[PDB]
Design a binder for this molecule. Structure first.
Ligand SMILES: [C][C][C][C][C][C][C][C]C(=O)O[C]([C]OC(=O)[C][C][C][C][C][C][C])[C]OP([O])(=O)O[C][C]N([C])([C])[C]
Lengths: 95, 101, 49, 77, 140, 50
């Protein structure tokens, strides 16, 4: 049914998400965002970047490039990206 | 050394209702204290005493003493601990404190 | 001047900066020297070209 | 797990040796008091805060959050 | 005297007497913004003093002697005796101290098992020692 | 299929009960202490002294 080409585009998504969780947080630490506003800010901007990724790079068809796309873009690698955001936010708040 | 607490039961505000009460001290309605006291022995005659100050009073108060010799020595308030125990009853006493002296 | 709780705001007058820079430089050079060996040996031996 | 056990213990050893009895920063989020017990080992105060941390806290976060940096600099399994 | 402190050598800009020319025992600074002072003359006479701009809201004062602790109330720019705690013929007060104002960082000391004792914080307190002969005792 | 959900819930709840509930969770009274008030004792008085 499916081939072993999902790994490549999955890796591209992972690179995009990783590179969009260490400039968020750093920006938050530059603005001296406080405890809960920071988390709400991160959730809003991170899901916005996921949506614009679904629109722009993926051509409005999450299927045909991932299987179960709502599971794979949004919920997968979410607790591996809140923590990188926390690291960058702590690094930014201390400068 | 005597230390003053609102109530000695481990979780109680017997008084000090803080929401909207607007206490009136001149009537005498205020809450009254409870206290715990201890005594210590020092070698040398202490001529006078003071307590140190900082910008925000976070660090320990460092009771500072001028002796009869003129030498000046301080001891932190952590050493002068009321509610202390003889270090036999401090072992595996979960209720005590963090780093109970 | 007295410091009842120790001096934690100002770091130290006896900080060992040179040992820390020596550790960083040792790690940097050992990585830079071990990288060609692992790269060439394992990548060219695992595919048996 | 030797891969887990060797380097994290070595780094804890190095951090507790070189960086002790300091206040490094304040975290942006309020922890609970047992984290004041865990994180402020350097200092012997009693009411400083929970939000003010010694140097070891910077390791306790950097262990969890370094995966994206390792991915970006270029590494593979 | 009123003195102008400058980076250079200061200047004594004013000298003048008080209203009553008696020997001065002590001076207490009253509220900062009203620029008041309570002056205790030997012979134990109290004068309220309002110097210059520096160019019910009761106010309470407390004086102590070797004979006891006295207390006063300042109302309508006049001083009034309010109570007295005087020692006996053979007692003599030796040490006295006031509660210094302190920034409040934590409201209670916390125990292991995370219970909190809620330390007593009431601002208007004073402590003193009475030394008694004829029983050889020290009272706090 | 709900057996998998319930079992994974038990595996999610064992960690909460056994290890995070030792001292690292609120609903203790010693955790809401930094969000309590002072009661503003005098509110009309000064009390200067020596
Ligand atoms: C390990 C990651 C770091 C997570 C720390 C939580 C950060 C969110 C946070 O600050 O919420 C705090 C954490 O107060 C507490 O410390 C209680 C924790 C409540 C969550 C427990 C989860 C089981 C509680 O909400 P709050 O409204 O009662 O506090 C006052 C408002 N605030 C100043 C916080 C804006």
């Amino acid at each position: 049914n499916a081939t072993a080409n999902v790994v490549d585009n999955k890796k591209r998504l992972l690179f995009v998400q990783d590179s969009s969780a260490l400039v968020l947080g750093l920006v938050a630490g530059f603005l001296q965002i406080e405890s809960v506003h920071g988390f709400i800010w991160f959730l809003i901007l991170y899901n916005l970047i996921n949506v614009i990724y679904i629109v722009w790079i993926c051509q409005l068809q999450p299927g045909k490039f991932y299987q179960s796309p709502l599971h794979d873009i949004f919920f997968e690698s979410f607790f591996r990206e809140i923590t990188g955001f926390v690291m960058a936010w702590t690094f930014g708040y201390a400068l | 050394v005597v230390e003053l607490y609102e109530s000695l039961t481990p979780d109680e505000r017997l008084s000090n209702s803080s929401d909207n009460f607007s206490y009136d001290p001149l009537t005498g309605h205020i809450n009254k204290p409870q206290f715990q006291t201890k005594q210590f022995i020092f070698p040398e005659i202490i001529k006078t005493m003071s307590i140190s100050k900082t910008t925000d009073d976070i660090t320990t108060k460092a009771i500072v003493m001028e002796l009869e010799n003129g030498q000046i020595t301080y001891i932190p308030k952590l050493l002068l601990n009321a509610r202390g125990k003889p270090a036999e009853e401090m072992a595996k006493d979960k209720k005590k404190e963090f780093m109970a002296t | 001047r007295i410091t009842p709780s120790g001096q934690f705001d100002l770091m130290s007058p006896t900080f060992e900066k040179g040992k820390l820079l020596i550790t960083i430089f040792v790690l940097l050079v050992i990585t830079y020297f071990i990288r060609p060996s692992v790269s060439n040996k394992k990548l060219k031996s695992q595919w048996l070209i | 797990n030797m891969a887990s056990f060797i380097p994290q213990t070595i780094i804890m050893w190095w951090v507790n040796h070189f960086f002790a009895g300091f206040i490094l920063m304040q975290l942006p989020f309020p922890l609970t008091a047992k984290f004041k017990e865990m994180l402020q080992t350097g200092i012997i105060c009693q009411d400083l805060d929970v939000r003010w941390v010694s140097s070891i806290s910077w390791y306790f976060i950097s262990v969890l959050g370094l995966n994206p940096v390792y991915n970006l600099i270029g590494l593979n399994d | 005297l009123t003195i102008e402190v400058t980076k250079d050598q200061p200047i004594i800009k004013s000298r003048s007497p008080l209203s009553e020319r008696k020997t001065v025992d002590s001076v207490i600074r009253l509220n900062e913004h009203d620029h008041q002072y309570l002056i205790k003359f030997e012979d134990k006479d109290h004068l309220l003093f309002k110097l210059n701009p520096g160019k019910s809201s009761h106010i309470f004062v407390t004086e102590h002697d070797t004979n006891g602790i006295y207390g006063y109330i300042i109302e309508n720019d006049t001083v009034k005796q309010t109570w007295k705690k005087a020692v006996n013929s053979k007692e003599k007060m030796v040490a006295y101290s006031k509660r210094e104002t302190t920034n409040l960082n934590t409201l209670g000391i916390t125990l292991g098992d995370k219970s909190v004792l809620y330390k007593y914080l009431y601002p208007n307190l004073a402590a003193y020692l009475i030394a008694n002969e004829e029983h050889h005792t020290i009272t706090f | 299929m709900f057996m998998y959900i319930v079992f994974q819930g038990v595996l999610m709840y064992i960690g909460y009960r056994k290890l995070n509930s030792m001292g690292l969770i609120p609903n203790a009274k010693g955790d809401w202490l930094p969000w309590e008030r002072i009661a503003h004792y005098n509110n009309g008085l000064q009390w200067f002294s020596d």
